[PDB]
């Protein structure tokens, strides 16, 4: 160690991972690529090292801690997760955990591929009319929980906080029908490390996407 | 008491967990929902059960067990995995296992988004495109190991076998540049429960997608 946490200069893909490595105390470094802003959208920094880290599937994010070299979101926040006993322990609260975790890339998705369509001006209607909905589900999934899985917090939290997050400030109204999800945005942002964390220059809520975003690009 | 493994009587995205299911040597049962022809592509036989089976975030395919109700497929070829320990055992294999899931959707997602896309001749050259390189990556990452995350076989295995076998539909010989992608999939049909599998009426190869698809619809 310290590990190192590979991704752009950007909260996209990263917001969990960050946050994550921060609540579990983790010792780490990062790696903030930066993408070209002309039509070029130069990516030396990336390209340059980006098949001399040992990587199966060169991506970004990347989580390099030792011998594990480690790409994918959801596997590197499981690998932490293991590490830490925080993957859900029965296996109702593990289920719950897997079934979030993938309806949320679901649903990220969704979001992005909206946002860096040239279109996003006159696609967006859709995406406001069924987000109700949307929210609804994760509503009524949480319930009276303080956490997803149940009473304790697990990795999938952290990918529930940046969706539901990113969903608040794409459409600031789109939580206020669902209390539930308001106080767990803010329980979540009241962890002792996160809130700390977050009045750090090393928090990176913006920009959401890359500069080839029409949406959340900056 | 059968498990109850629910989707469309299609292939679509529940053949890893089909295969799985009969690898583990599972008791279960299925539903395959019919849907309708065009223009209405009638889904009632599954709307009216959708709300009815205690599903936190209703969607095909389900897979019932008791009190377990789960959706998303990942989360059920994982509820499946840990239940015969086939997740992966070592911090290594566990890894491969993450990233190669996690990378096998993405593909998935990919494709899906392609065939059930009106515009499918025009943007079938993209997809093409990407293609070599995507196989070329599967191939690297499984080496000269017999299964994708080591010695012995994970649930991972079907995954791949489902993306592998149905690219290979797609674009014949996108394989054949990959000897060990090949031999992969002889290795798996060759599986005794998976060989006697592919020789009853249960199997179901087609069609890849629901009467919605431009391509893979039969």
Redesign the interface.
């Known amino acids: 160690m310290p590990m190192t946490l590979g991704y752009w200069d950007i909260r996209g893909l990263a917001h969990a991972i960050r946050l994550f490595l921060e609540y579990t105390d983790s010792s780490y470094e990062e790696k903030r690529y930066t993408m070209g802003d002309a039509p070029d959208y130069d990516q030396s920094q990336w390209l340059n090292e980006k098949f001399k880290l040992g990587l ?2 060169p991506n970004l994010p990347y989580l390099i801690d030792g011998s ?1 070299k ?6 590197i926040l ?2 932490l997760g ?1 590490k830490h006993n925080l993957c859900g322990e029965t ?2 609260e ?3 955990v ?2 979030l ?3 949320l ?1 679901d649903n990220r ?1 969704v979001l992005a591929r909206l946002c860096y369509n040239a279109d996003f001006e006159k696609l967006k209607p859709g995406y406001l009319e069924q987000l109700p909905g949307m929210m609804r ?1 994760y509503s ?2 949480l319930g009276k929980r303080p956490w997803f899985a149940g009473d304790k917090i697990t990795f999938v939290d952290f990918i529930a906080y940046d969706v539901l997050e990113r969903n608040q400030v794409f459409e600031a109204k789109c939580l206020d029908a669902f209390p539930n999800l308001k106080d767990f945005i803010a329980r979540f942002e009241g962890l002792k490390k996160i809130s700390d964390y977050m009045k750090t220059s090393r928090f990176l809520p913006r920009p959401m996407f890359t500069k080839m975003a029409t949406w959340g690009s900056n």
């Open positions: 199966d599937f594990h480690i790409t994918q979101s959801n596997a499981r690998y293991r296996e109702e593990r289920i719950r897997d079934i975790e993938n309806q890339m998705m589900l009524e999934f």
